[PDB]
């Protein structure tokens, strides 16, 4: 199915475990086994969302910029930029809070009754096509639990403050 | 006309009200009702301009980077990146100062006389095609009132300082 | 030739003069006179290079992100994002040091003798196609004079330090 | 083969040597000798990866943004934006730690036995296709030695801390 | 308001009914009502898919090219290119065959059991005369019924041979 | 100065008059006068829309492809590809039909009353023989008059059948 | 799980076997199983290369255009455009000639000695009747064997003349 | 080293000489020598311009499409698509007419006086029978000499009528 699944898994684990050296090893193993640098780049973007999230909201951009290097310069400089991204994500503060918050929200939308939009939340349009915030039943619902890492330190302080 | 108008409105309200949990709920509701992640992404960009503006000038880039994830990786990781953007905009400092400043300027351009460009403001070209700042009648006009939030704290201090 | 030359000039002057209100006025005047938002966006990028430069190296990205909003969402939200860019560049620290440094270097390349590359500066390749720093005659040449504004404060301190 | 090799080499050396004036000179020499601004832009991206790396992880984005200016506005404003990038990379903190770490990892992957993925590193998937971190033999392997420059100061402190 | 979505509907119906003159009228009305040309551009892509399909596969590219003109050149050249796309789509051969084929296939995938992939079609084939592409329950199923129009003339000829 | 905009005009007139040799001369003069090739590329897209239109819908794509070469490869390959686009446009069948159609439709939308969307054309039809695409005041209006040139030969044949 | 990669295989085999109806079924099953449409879009590009090749060079562009629709418009329009690409590829003339040609050439480049570039083919020719494009060891080698299908009908005619 | 640029030259000469099999061999050798496929992709675009020109204007698009596959899918699908582009270019009708036309026009613009734009061709015409597109010194000049190959067959027919 996917010849590189174990390798990519080990790479993921090393990044989430803040082990840049082992991450570079597994990355090297994938390339030398004939794996595509963009196969890894796509999974790096997934790691930014799943494991770093709002602890470092710039991580997404570092990974996209590495991909842009591949797209503009080529495969070999691309490889090097993606290595730089791997190291960045490895040493970045980690938080899966946004990941798990979204997953919960999505499962609740699927499962719970389709409550009406409370009338006071209606009519808040945007410039697009032409020039309690929950339903009452769900009051106090919390999906997002910011950690004490990276930019989530300030976030957590702000959300608690205004809680 | 737009089956998701109320949902999107509730999402907008939750973001502008710095309620990340409720924002994720309404986002989840849209997706589970068959709404497109990019339908929401476009409205997120509008929220960056309208409700965050220069309080956090990097907000635009976070939302564009989420969209880039959708475009490169796909729908499911895209959804997750757009969730991260929703949370970012929810907890960001808020200011509609740039939004309302532009709207005023634009209405005045439409309505007021078409005053000449003051001669001393003429001939300030750029490298493009080949290698009082108001009209006198409008002296002292002010459209932009920076708030005390985010990067608008410094801005306001600078504009007042040089006022 | 260009019906909007005076207007764009007045806009440029207001931005370089850190007058966000007047900049929004001239921007509004251009749009209401039928001028294209991207006509202005291209000139905003030129202003980032010419008038802000390394005093705020992120200014380029704010202007490109505004253009990306236009490209993805559309004309009306585009207009609003470009307004946000105008305000950002208006309040940004200003420096034309990079602009004038490049212009000087380029005129000297055109005019001065084509001196050989000093042998000790040869062979410093990059990964691209496959996996005294002046000529002696020009020793001590200086084109770049960082200002005391924005990120040029640190730059100037570093270049002087290592001078 | 490449008429601009010596010039580009001298440019590279000046950037790596934090000599912005000489870098602008060699850049000017290339352009006036008929060299393409994107020929230089591609090599600037390579310099970001090789010589700046994680000492300034935003350097990649500055160079890509300069290229975007060329792509959207044109050759002449492009030239100016790429000059701004040259100066940025010249004054940026320097580190070849990510470069040499990747090169080592890659050579080891090529040369050493293809060790199995340790079972405890398996099954760590991502949302992609549908909704000791080394092998035992290589325990304690280190490729990445962050310097004391730029953002590598914090990185080094963190990796040592958790060592 | 609701009147706005009526203009969009009139435009869609006119393009679908091969009425280029009326299509241009409704487009012009949409523009003068403050409608965003990119909002229109998105609907045009949906039209290429739904109403033209493989009667003219190039249709998709004409509408994307119009969008590219808007993104690169600006709003006014964009509106002109989108008008050209509107006329192109209006006079193009119409076919809803690909659209209705995909919908029928989705309802079967949703409504009928999740039949096993026939053994010979598996990533590693297993012991089953292995000539069927459908599960045996779905043998000889047809979703796609090419029209006698445009490029579907030849496709319908070919599919009848195949059978 | 004004002489520069005269070169642009000479180039436009030559392409429109199907004079490829003169077109290349004026382009070459524009380049030697310091004119930006992308500035020229933008005018070429306007030409494809205004002067070629649906006589050759692929025209748009040739000019976009030339722009892509400039963005990806560089200035000099770009200038060569733009020359190719200039010759392509110069020898292409000419038609101003789509251009003048769109302008006429806009003047009607601006000058005549905002007639209601016919009931059957509304997003939810209402009680009205519902065969008209125009408001009854505009019955049988024609804006688009295909030439006898290029792809418009066949279009004009078809529209006459329809009527 | 492994069942998922079986759906991908069934889809590939159906497109290759020119079975558009079965192809749409397997696509629909992939979607309902939670499969990402872009994951499918990437496989479609590999199919255009491997199974269609130069029998229809436009194939590549239809699949890229479907991807563009997904990136610009969204997931649901994207899935529809990808269905259109699936049908396009299914009914297209099939040829594996370019694919097998490239593979054979790579095995020779890997397995046979690194023969010198014939003197007349060098960047600076040297003293050698200089009519050979292959090294003399490889004289008259053929990798590319166009089918009698699609655009390869004419190519095969031409290559036989040449010989 | 210099041997590397010899491989590039052999590849260019083979494509130009319409030798697809040798072209694939030299490409394969370039890859096994560590050559970057995008470096090759850039040369292919220069080839489309220089050696194919308007004998097949679609050539440019096939090479850009191959590049898109590399950027979106990855290195290995990219190398395959680039091989397809190599074969496409090798079997395409060859014409150097657009290339040599543009070069001749540039040498005239550089070597002859900067003649005035004929009065009738100016942005605002002035008092001069105003039928000339060239300055009177350049009357009847021809740069562009279409071959009898590909799309230039028809172009040459047309230009002879015009004269």
Describe this structure in words.
Chains A, B, C, D: Belongs to the AAA ATPase family. RarA/MGS1/WRNIP1 subfamily. With 163 residues, chain A is mostly helical. The first copy, chain A, has 2 domains: 1-96, Zinc Finger, Delta Prime, domain 3; 97-122 and 125-163, DNA polymerase III clamp loader subunits, C-terminal domain (post-AAA+ oligomerization domain-like), CATH 1.10.3710.10. Helices cover 60% and strands 0% of the residues of chain A. At the A-D interface, α1, α2, α3, α4 and α5 of A face α3, α4, α6 and α7 of D.
Task: Present the secondary structure layout.
The structure is a homooctamer of 163-residue chains.
Chain A lengths: L4 H12 L3 H13 L4 H16 L6 H14 L2 H17 L5 H15 L40 H11 L1
Helix pairs in contact in A: 1-2, 1-3, 2-5, 3-4, 3-5, 4-5
Helix/strand-derived class of chain A?
mainly alpha
DSSP strand content of chain A: under 5%
Helix content of chain A: 55-70%
Shape of chain A: elongated
Biggest interface: A-B, 45 and 49 residues
**N-to-C CA distance of chain A:** 47 Å
Order of SSEs of chain A: HHHHHHH
Number of domains of chain A: 2
**Count of helical stretches of chain A:** 7
Oligomeric state of the chains? homooctamer
CATH first level of the largest domain in chain A: which class? Answer: Mainly Alpha
Protein name (chains A, B, C, D): Replication-associated recombination protein A
Family (chains A, B, C, D): Belongs to the AAA ATPase family. RarA/MGS1/WRNIP1 subfamily.
Function (chains A, B, C, D): DNA-dependent ATPase that plays important roles in cellular responses to stalled DNA replication processes.
């Amino acid at each position: 199915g996917d010849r590189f699944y174990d390798l990519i898994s080990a790479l993921h684990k090393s990044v989430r475990g803040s082990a840049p050296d082992a991450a570079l090893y597994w990355y090297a193993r994938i390339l030398t086994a004939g794996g595509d640098p963009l196969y890894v780049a796509r999974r790096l973007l997934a790691i930014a969302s799943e494991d770093v999230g709002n602890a470092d909201p710039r991580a997404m951009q570092v990974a996209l910029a590495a991909w842009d290097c591949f797209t503009r310069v080529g495969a070999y400089e691309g490889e090097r930029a993606i290595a730089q991204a791997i190291i960045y994500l490895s040493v970045a503060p980690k938080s899966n809070a946004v990941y798990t918050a979204f997953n919960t929200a999505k499962q609740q939308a699927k499962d719970l009754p389709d409550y009406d939009v409370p009338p006071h939340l209606r009519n808040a349009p945007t410039n697009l096509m032409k020039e309690n915030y929950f339903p009452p039943e769900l009051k106090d619902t919390q999906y997002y639990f910011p950690t004490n890492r990276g930019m989530e330190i300030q976030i957590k302080e702000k959300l608690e403050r205004l809680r």
